[PDB]
Design a protein around this ligand. Sequence first.
Ligand SMILES: [Zn+2]
Ligand SMILES: [Zn+2]
Lengths: 190, 278, 287, 377, 263, 162
Amino acid sequence: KAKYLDLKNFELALRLRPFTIPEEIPYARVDVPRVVLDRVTQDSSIYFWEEIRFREKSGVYFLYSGPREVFDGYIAPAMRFLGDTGIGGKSTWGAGLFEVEFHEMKIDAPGSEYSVTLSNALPTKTPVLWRLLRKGGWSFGRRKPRMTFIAEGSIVKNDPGGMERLELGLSHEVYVYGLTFPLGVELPEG
Amino acid sequence: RFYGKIVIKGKIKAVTGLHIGSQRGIANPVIKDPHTGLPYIPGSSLKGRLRSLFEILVNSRLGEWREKYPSLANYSPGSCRPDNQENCGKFFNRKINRGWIHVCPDYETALACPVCRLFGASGKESNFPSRIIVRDAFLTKEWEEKWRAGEAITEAKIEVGIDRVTSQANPRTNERVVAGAEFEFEIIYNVENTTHWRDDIKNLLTAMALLEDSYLGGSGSRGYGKVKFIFDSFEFRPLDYYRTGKDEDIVSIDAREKSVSDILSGFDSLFSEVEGKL
Amino acid sequence: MDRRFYGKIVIKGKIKAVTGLHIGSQRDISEIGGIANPVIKDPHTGLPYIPGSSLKGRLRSLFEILVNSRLGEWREKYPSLANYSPGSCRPDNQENCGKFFNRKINRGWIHVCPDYETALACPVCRLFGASGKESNFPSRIIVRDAFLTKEWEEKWRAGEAITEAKIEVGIDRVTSQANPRTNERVVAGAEFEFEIIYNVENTTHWRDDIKNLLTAMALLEDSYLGGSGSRGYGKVKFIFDSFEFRPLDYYRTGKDEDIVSIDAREKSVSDILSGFDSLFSEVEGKL
Amino acid sequence: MTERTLKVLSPLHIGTGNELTPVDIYPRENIIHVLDTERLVNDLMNLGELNEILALLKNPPAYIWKGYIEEFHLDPSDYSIYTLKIHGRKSMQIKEFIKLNGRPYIPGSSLKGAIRTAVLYKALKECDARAVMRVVSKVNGDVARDIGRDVLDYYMSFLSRKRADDLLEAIVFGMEPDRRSKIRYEPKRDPMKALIVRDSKPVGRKHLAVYHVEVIGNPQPIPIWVEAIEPGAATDVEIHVDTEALRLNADYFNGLLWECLKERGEPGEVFEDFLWEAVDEFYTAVMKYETIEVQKFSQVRSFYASLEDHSGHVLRLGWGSGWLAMTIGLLLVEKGYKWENVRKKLGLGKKGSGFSREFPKTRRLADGMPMGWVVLE
Amino acid sequence: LGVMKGDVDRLGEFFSSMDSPSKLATASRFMDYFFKGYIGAIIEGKFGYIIGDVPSLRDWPEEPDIVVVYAGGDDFFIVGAWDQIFELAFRVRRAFNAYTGGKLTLSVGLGYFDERTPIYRMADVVSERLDTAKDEGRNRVFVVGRSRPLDGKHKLSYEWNHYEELWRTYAPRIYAGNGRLKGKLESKKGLLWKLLEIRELYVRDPNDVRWAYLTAYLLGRHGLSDLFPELVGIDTKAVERKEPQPVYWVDGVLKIVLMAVRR
Amino acid sequence: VDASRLFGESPDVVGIKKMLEKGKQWEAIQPYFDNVVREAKNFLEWSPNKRLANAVTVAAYLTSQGLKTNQVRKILDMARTTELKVKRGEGDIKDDLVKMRYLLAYTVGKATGQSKYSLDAFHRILDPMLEVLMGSPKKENFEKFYDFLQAVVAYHKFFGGG
RNA sequence: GUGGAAAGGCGGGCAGAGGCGGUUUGC
RNA sequence: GCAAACCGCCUCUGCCCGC
Ligand SMILES: [Zn+2]
Ligand SMILES: [Zn+2]
């Protein structure tokens, strides 16, 4: 039933070692109620709204492999723009805002023929052991079509992934990210 | 197109007990962070109260503002409540569930309305996003330490209802924040167009100046609001800040100024470099 | 239908407790040894105060009874009072009928009009506001909480008693046996800085809503505030500092363009008194 | 009327449940003085300790514990009252008067509780043939009040902290619906919730003095020291009835007092006139009753014969008003044996029971003046 | 709106014990019949000798307002009135205790929701309140959402015999049946809401002993020294055995009664 | 019997309230625990439940006497105001602890009659802690005083006095 | 080239009604 | 020669309506 693992217990599950699940998830899914008040008569109309509320030290992070000239040219100036606008959700109510720090992670992974995906997959060939994720977002008010991704941690073999460009009636072409983030993994017989 | 982000930091002072309910051991609880148990002011209770005060401000001045803001010429002062027809001639034109709000119906009209240009519009084939971001105000470090020192941060107040003839008392309780608290707010305006941002800052300060004489949430008419904006700093965050990352933003200095010593007392003075760099 | 905004008539001043005031709370808030029946207190500063709920409701209580005395004399000047007859819905447990006290809150009947446009022509429910199903007219006055004034802050620092304990004993007439209790009260002569903000919505009827708020104020200096006022504890006296107007051009500019009426030495029965039109004549010159 | 001023004809002590210990007092002269311990103790440190916390807790041979400040210091007093009598050998506990800032006033809860005794006396005089129709509505116990036969002749045998007046206040002021007993009091049903009396203006320091109250009725009289307002002080008090609060409650009041107002005319109109006719009929009747007993002191009767030909409304207040003036039992003298078994049921004498002097034995009079007379007008 | 969601615990180990296809075909019909046919006759008020005394707010109606959304063979998701979803979870548990030989258990999550809540959210909450009761002991009920410190020594869910014994002590002294309190506690909810605020001082710091005498003063001045004679004195054996104080488990009995009352 | 009931930390909160509703058993075993309270001269002698243990033994021995709370309210409200000063208002109670010692000394200088012993035992306990509080800080070591003095009054209502 | 865009948990509700710091008698 | 006894709270109310 466990969804996540530590940085240390991940390196054990890549080697088919005994591992332990974490005791605590760093966030909650609360349902804050809002209201829509009439402007003349102050009449109320409750709707419900769900969120992700982190703890005192907790947060969220992603990983980047790539050349450093692409990082500090593109990924690093973009993440400071996004510190003052949102990542999804009601950014006008102060949701997707954050402060960005840069560090270094090192993962011990066994060299193999297979690999796990640390991002959405959108595979070319059929993968080994997977888990379907089905979502399609929004782009300038245009509703993206739903695309069968693969959830994270699923197992592929020699797959690069690949982005699908879409039309959506805009001026510019919309690319949808489906590249995989391969880390080596050890498997049983299927 | 993006030019920069005018950033407004300061403090919210609850001069009187502030109550923003949740309706879920006190019988009417103010909302709270689920991990700390501390109260906070949302960014959505602050924004809809800055907007509800400003929409009634525009509603009185539809005729006088037909030639500074277009698409106030398509609205008549009043609500569309009796004749149940949305986007009609009157002002409060969109019914959500049972409440009527001014939301302009198209992108081509929300770029002219002073409410929807600053606060946003939904529309059909429109989706005008807002230009301000209102963060959730949390207690100041000095008031999180009083939570560590064992004090009470939210009192519980008992009212009563009394018959006009026989004086039968009928009480209830309302949790509300202890008066005197200091929150920390944040409003990040998004400089899309470089021409009409002065009218979008001066309208946002007008919504705050009406909020210092109205209330914030709760009972209010029985004295549960009485808020006070205490500004700290305004920063510009230019477009050159985000590309190269070097710290050359333009910072205004206002440690102890009001919301009315800031609107015109220093408006030509405090925004002198921001109006120069544009 | 058609809510507008022209400004905020602000009524400041002070409340003089000529006889000692007692706005009671409940205890048990991590408090152990104290006078029974305590005055309510600001939990941060420690001092007593007067809630806006205790003052907006007490002015509503005295003015609703003033209108119930005359349901044949105000109806020539206000519509929708012809819907109501003098009485209460206590002899017939039905909410909205011809009786003037119509809302059972929990058990107590209080004149609140059930609709917007019925309450828009009511002299009570346009000044104090109303709740309803589908109408919900909101109020036009807000009454804030009144803490001690800045000089009575300093008397607390100097060690002077800001409260006291009065012991009242109830005696059975037949056996002459006392049943003693101690009631905390604010010391007589104390002074609280108050705040009433009227919200000017319709410029046709705003004379009346100030002439009715100043009517209920003059009824409150004749009546009592809080406490057990039939045994002494009331006797509020309103000491005005300054009426101000706050026009719509104030909140947009920021310049001090408010029309400041001066009654710094006048009385609540002297503002309603000849001179009402002498003091608010520059408000009418601005509207 | 508003601001109906009063005057004071005898010593008048409104207690606060507090006495002055002899460490608070040092009488240098026939005048006395109230020393300020908080300021004097904190003012006697500059010359120096733990000796003050030891000596005040010890309470030795008072005189020396207040005259030890005379060594290298003097002049630390608060109010400095006058003794006005041949006493004070300190050995006394002066009971103090109620004061709001060290200034004596008359509390309005104490002048209302004297009018309530006068009004209760008038209701039991005029209201047994009409007292059944009051409890005919939602009480069902008036048949016991009819078969006994003027509900007083039942209440002497009905009884046969102390809740003795519980039924009698529930008949004259407030009939409830039901209880574990027959009926009970309801504060929401009361004409006296329309009677508004307020605290008077403060009297003054010049009219306050200590007294020496001697108790007479035994061969060995006892003195009690107390402070009281001297006779001749006049302050102003405002009493008014809110007639608007009676018009709203014309159907909700259920009591014998309400059935005394519907017979003088409009019951929300004559209640203020009924109010003072109840005052000058309880307190003049207790004024005449004390001319029978001559056990006091002579000069006491020369005070009572002079209380007549005095304009205004005369009533008791305070602490020296005896059992005869705080209580219905002036009306319960004419029963005799119907109240004689019940007065021993309630109990009286202690340290068994007083046989022939059960209720009226004690008289507390200050300097040969029967204390506690205040005349409104 | 009250929602329960339950399932049989360690059931895969039970069916793995069957060694022959006729033995599997018996154990899989009898378990199927409890959640298909006999869960109907529990709601029908039958089997009173077998069920007995369960924590009931109101007495059992002739027609319960219960809508069985699903009941599969181990799993059941039942919605209804929140007072009768509460009682039925103890009434399903006792009958399942005796339909078996006392060998198989249940685990029930319980939620109390607004009417106008999306149903995919009422499932995702009670599925978490079921799994919180499931990774702790697998014979225990989640009753009401509850505050507790993050020290790992306190668990939100009650065991079945623990809560059903906490109800036979604390409910017949404060609760009379059918939404009314007892004598000497009518118009005294202000005792009970502040009693939960004293319980919040245990939540903020369990090592602080300030809750012990504030209980004694608040029960004292109301004259109720007879009610709750163990919330005044700290249990030293519970600190010895490293189990929570009795002020911690009283929340699941009070807060149900405070919800039962108009509040 | 009473000494075995009066155990170390919370020996019998439910048990002593029944026995205090007695004469010879509590005149000795609580006298040893009153002497145990006086032998703990330092106010910071109990970081554990022993403040909650002393105050139960104090308020059981005082409930055997009278101990009207009304007589003590001048001290009890004075302890409330001095704790209110600690909230960033003042930091020196030494100018007013002497007043609170004097109000404690004035109270026993007044309390005469059958209620001498109800104030003599009350005089015996707080003053060795007020000796320590003279030369002490007021945010700390007075925090432990005022919480001890609450638990004395709090259990005194539970045992049935006031 | 963001499962997005718009959306105040609030409208109305006196902690209030009743209540002499008192009386008794001795050690 | 001056007091010492008892009484220190009692009894009614406690979230509605509206999405
Ligand atoms: Zn618009
Ligand atoms: Zn109305």
